[PDB]
Amino acid sequence: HAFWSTQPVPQTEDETEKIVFAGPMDEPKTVADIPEEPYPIASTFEWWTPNMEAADDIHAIYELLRDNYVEDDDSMFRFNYSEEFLQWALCPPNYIPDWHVAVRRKADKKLLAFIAGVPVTLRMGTPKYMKVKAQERGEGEEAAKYDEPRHICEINFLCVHKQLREKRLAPILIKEATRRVNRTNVWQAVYTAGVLLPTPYASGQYFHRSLNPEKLVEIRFSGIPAQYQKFQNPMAMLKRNYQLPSAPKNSGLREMKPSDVPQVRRILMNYLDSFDVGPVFSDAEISHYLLPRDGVVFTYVVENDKKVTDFFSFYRIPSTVIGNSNYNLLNAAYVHYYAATSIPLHQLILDLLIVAHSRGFDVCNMVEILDNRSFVEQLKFGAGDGHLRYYFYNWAYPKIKPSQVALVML
Ligand SMILES: CCCCCCCCCCCCCC(=O)SCCNC(=O)CCNC(=O)[C@H](O)C(C)(C)COP(=O)(O)OP(=O)(O)OC[C@H]1O[C@@H](n2cnc3c(N)ncnc32)[C@H](O)[C@@H]1OP(=O)(O)O
Hints:
Layout: H1 13-16, E1 45-48, H2 55-68, E2 77-79, H3 83-90, E3 100-105, E4 111-123, H4 128-135, H5 140-143, E5 150-160, H6 169-183, E6 189-193, E7 202-210, H7 213-218, H8 234-242, E8 253-255, H9 261-272, E9 278-279, H10 283-290, E10 297-304, E11 307-321, E12 329-340, H11 345-358, E13 363-367, E14 381-393
Parallel strand pairs: 5-6, 12-13
Antiparallel strand pairs: 1-3, 2-11, 3-4, 4-5, 4-9, 6-14, 7-13, 7-14, 8-10, 10-11, 11-12
Tetradecanoyl-COA binds at residues 1-4, 68-70, 153, 155-160, 165-171, 174, 177-178, 181-182, 186-189, 191, 193, 195, 197, 393-394.
């Protein structure tokens, strides 16, 4: 690892396994110690900070990701994050525009690479159980040192043009992004990836709940499981197995609206503070991340006797179906944040599935963070072949189960 061997991250699993306290990797620094000038690059390339209040700029990023962002190992599906989605994801309250870092070609101003950082406030102190192991050694003082939430950077949408792959461009992007974050006096970041890098503090497998199995089989996202072949019409029985009620079972379920924001913030933060790693949200950020938004984020509440008691949200990311004969797009819903006080979690997520299905989604996707693992079987989710790995930059963190992670990454 010619690049990651130089960075302040735990370098191996044997080393992450032997970590028992949260805290930084690198000795302190100041803004003064960080270069003022952007890092140098090829003569035909320049750095470009896009303006996310301008549809031209958003459009140029959209096209780069649409054609060059994450594909599956078979090159059959590729994320097609929408423009509305990108403006939502990249511009939460207090976002910093200088954290959105691009390289374009001088000659024709063509977008060639991208990486985005947005600020988040994250609890990232010693996990509860490692703290118990610590209170026993009288080391409680060290274990609790970094328990207060920290304002850090969340990195996403790293992307290099297919025609420029393997020219060490991503390390220059990563470094220039680090620089700009450091000049802002931020020293930690959180990020996720489907690939193994040095070194995750958690990993969760992906799970999928089929909503339109016929289409999913047609485009070869899924197949017909062998035991359906004992039927005269396997596809009919597969559809029956995945069939859903026509409308929600929970009366009192309604779309979220702005007046709901403080009660949703209350119940969410009670649920989220249960977990070792989880975000801390103000009313503004709750509003930004949960309030319905057409084609992007969908959020519903259970109102019992005037009070909000439960809620769920999901977000939409279609994927390009790469050269298919009947289909352009896979329409996928992704379980977002949620909270249950009045009903079992699986009864609440069953209404998420019913709503997603009625709004035309083909599949419901999730990672086994939060308590997602606990309803996989009750709700006929299938296990996928990929995992999402959680990483910290410049933060030593003990290994934890994904069910102790509460940060949903877009
Ligand atoms: C304090 C603030 C800190 C801020 C920074 C925090 C850290 C944030 C870090 C980033 C978090 C991003 C989270 C997301 O958004 S994850 C999703 C990333 N996107 C894609 O996979 C889209 C399709 N692929 C591509 O666009 C390119 O292949 C990419 C850009 C991924 C690599 O480009 P390319 O294929 O042309 O290679 P290269 O010659 O330029 O560079 C080779 C080096 O790159 C290392 N590499 C490969 N894949 C990844 C990866 N996914 N995260 C981190 N590093 C990665 C690799 O180990 C090697 O280093 P080493 O093996 O030599 O050591």
